[PDB]
Amino acid sequence: SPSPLRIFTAGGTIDADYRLEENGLVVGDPFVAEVLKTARLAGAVSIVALSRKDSLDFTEADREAIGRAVGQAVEDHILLTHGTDTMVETARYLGGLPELAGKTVVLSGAMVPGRVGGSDAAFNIGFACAAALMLAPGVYIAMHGKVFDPAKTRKNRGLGRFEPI
Amino acid sequence: SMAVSPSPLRIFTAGGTIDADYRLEENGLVVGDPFVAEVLKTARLAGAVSIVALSRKDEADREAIGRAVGQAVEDHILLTHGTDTMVETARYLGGLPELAGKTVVLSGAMVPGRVGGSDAAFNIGFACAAALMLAPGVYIAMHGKVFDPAKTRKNRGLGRFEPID
Amino acid sequence: SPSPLRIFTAGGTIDADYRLEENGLVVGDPFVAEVLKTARLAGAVSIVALSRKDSLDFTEADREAIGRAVGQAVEDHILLTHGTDTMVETARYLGGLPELAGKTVVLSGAMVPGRVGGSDAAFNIGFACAAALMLAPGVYIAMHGKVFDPAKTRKNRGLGRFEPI
Amino acid sequence: SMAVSPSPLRIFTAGGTIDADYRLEENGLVVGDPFVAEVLKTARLAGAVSIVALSRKDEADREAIGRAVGQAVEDHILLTHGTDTMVETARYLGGLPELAGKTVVLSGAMVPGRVGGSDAAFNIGFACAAALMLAPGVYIAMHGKVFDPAKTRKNRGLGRFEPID
Ligand SMILES: [Cl-]
């Protein structure tokens, strides 16, 4: 084989792990690395850690630093693992950067942490890696076994899924 | 009308390592229930996927598969299958004119989904996205990449598909 | 086979599970039921749900209701799954009830939720079930592969383990 | 002096279903690395457990086991073992005067620890507690209960130990 894929990690629920000192979940090590370790990949794939800050908390400065970091990648196929609560805002922001116009940028994450039983994370990672390799240049959210247009997408808290507007 | 999520993908299960499970009576692995059903149960799909059983066995068998695939209404098809004869099945489906408008992807796992350290969940997400996003044809989706069956072979001892140059 | 064992659940970390609506862990269904489902038990074992309230929050009234509930059991072998933060206080309280003097009462739980990867919970449950069947009448904490005397025990936050005083 | 946690228990591994793992080359399960080591890695033990390898094979073999067990300094011994011949091993150890002061418990799993839905973690906790708490002798600890080897048999098709009345 495939075109080279670069993966950026911005934390979120997918990466949550339990810590005794917190008596609860923190943003841990990136779960995408745990999934790809056993995927027996053939192709060129490399992972870059960007942030473990609470995704809810992302400022314009955080989003800007992500856009610049993704621009540092010569790869044209990009996966960004991310919190779901501000995924639409990040995706809309990246969609407005002319610097990224030639890249396929896919955001994904998980509704349940990878390190918790019953997680969507491994499926989402496989689906998003294929989406990043296969879709035309642009910025997408890959969740729920489908591809969302960030400009026409919202997270619906009642449904527990992204939906079209 | 209120939005209706489509179910554009149909999955057929032909068994294979991906579906292996432990049985006390055999004191070993048999082909068990389809593991792709377990992955999709927790994938929080926006739509749904019709999963249909074709075989749990380890020329006529390939013909029954072509018939089931060719009869499907869906234009996006995933067949979970053993890796030992996946190339043979894929090459046979490749020659059926009935499939000309369909994206047909074969996949599976080198490690059973029910065994620790399995590629299965990743493979299922990657293959579902491949079946949705690739142009019509017949493909093997494994190792985070897409293989042309006519130009692919299985290496038994390394648990990998590899090109024929 | 063994003498009949009664298991009471008072929640705690062992039982934590992820909820989308909380965006984090809540006290969920009792994890001991998930472990015993695959233990292939021979003996008489039954589970009773007592509480899912935060164990940190337990009042004297909560502890008293637990002591009375355990007294309702005709079984002489008792496992109580519980939060670690107030486990010593509950165990010291039960140790002072003449009503329970003829019973073996073991408290246990987990430093990491059963539903999180890398959990001590399944081992703790097996070890505590044996302790409840095998120890002389009295009240114990079974954690870390050993038996603690509640009167001479504390949880050491720095160590992440119970230790003797 | 500052408290020193003892390591009163030694574990010997003779293989068996508990340790089975998937190998691509065999296209099936072999006896792999000892699963009891994986369980104890996350058990947050106050002490430690010396784990020693005796066999990974499927009269002389039983003699080597008696020798290793009889040479141990520890008075509390757990032997992880296949369930098919556990009774034979246990009966043989039962007749060795060298073991008269030792609590020796055999255990294992009807489902491999590396397969979903395994009894192994529970069995290991239950058996470690049995090895610490039972009076000297030789025992089989399975199904959440203690068996007298002289009066026990393995039922192959049900994956259970059962009494001889
Ligand atoms: Cl939490």
Numbering used by the authors:
A (entry chain B), C (entry chain B): 4 to 168
B (entry chain A), D (entry chain A): 0 to 57, 63 to 169
Q: What did the paper state?
A:
The region 58–62 of the main chain of protomer A of RrA(K19A) is disordered. However, the main chain adjacent to the mutation site is well ordered in both protomers, and the area occupied by the side chain of Lys19 in the native protein appears occupied only by water molecules. The kinetic data, even when reduced to approximate turnover numbers, demonstrate that Lys19 plays an important role during catalysis and its mutation reduces the rate of catalysis by two or more orders of magnitude.
L‐Asparaginases (ASNases) catalyze the hydrolysis of L‐Asn to L‐Asp and ammonia. Crystal structures of the wild‐type RrA, both with and without bound L‐Asp, as well as structures of several RrA mutants, reveal topologically unique tetramers.
